[PDB]
Ligand binder design. Sequence first.
Ligand SMILES: Cc1cccc2c1[C@@H](CCC(=O)O)CCC2
Length: 269
Amino acid sequence: KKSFQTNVYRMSKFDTYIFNNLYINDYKMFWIDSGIAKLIDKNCLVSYEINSSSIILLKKNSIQRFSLTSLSDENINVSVITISDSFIRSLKSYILGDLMIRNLYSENKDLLLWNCEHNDIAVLSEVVNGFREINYSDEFLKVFFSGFFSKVEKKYNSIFITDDLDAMEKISCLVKSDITRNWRWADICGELRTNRMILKKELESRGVKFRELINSIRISYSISLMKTGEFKIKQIAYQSGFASVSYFSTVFKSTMNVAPSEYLFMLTG
Ligand SMILES: Cc1cccc2c1[C@@H](CCC(=O)O)CCC2
């Protein structure tokens, strides 16, 4: 069970979630349970409709800019699964046992879509229900998720499970290992022993400057702390490395379109 962190958000008619410079700290997937939603991806400048069988995948270490809008009147529950790095790395012996195909894939897609059948959605639902009803062996989930990811990578002809030595993974592991450190460019270069010229590409490829990058990682770090049931916003701001509650709230509102305490309540309730 520890391999997954899950949440279910309610969404009334024609209301919209809006995410800007949302940093994806760990592999995430989401789907709606009924009705129709509109997804506008500002990174790919595309909009499209999703239904109860559309699974949307967000790649680890991407910077997401999209909105999700309900086009139903009946309320909609959005389920989100965050997959722990421990579990992702246990899959490697399944995805990369098929590596000669995988070298020919590209690395441009951060938000992937899968139209699946009922069984796939029954499995992910039970994941979202904390396996209260059906329990699943570690081998079943490893086979299921590795097979799921390789189907989606095949569809887009692009790698989804990145590898450890990717520059942006090194930057982001480093920042997350010491969230309250006063990070500057010079620290990244010195820890990774890598020229600014080369590391720079990972931030411009994602449309961020250094400050918005650090801020996005800290917002996700703070969202992770809110999910643990820690409830004090003032503590969460300082624990996530911000210098004031005001600055944390301003960045949070800019990223999530909701105030930190509004989000903290969407979790515990
Ligand atoms: C709050 C929400 C509602 C609907 C969809 C999505 C979200 C957040 C999930 C928050 C997280 O896990 O950090 C971002 C990904 C997709």
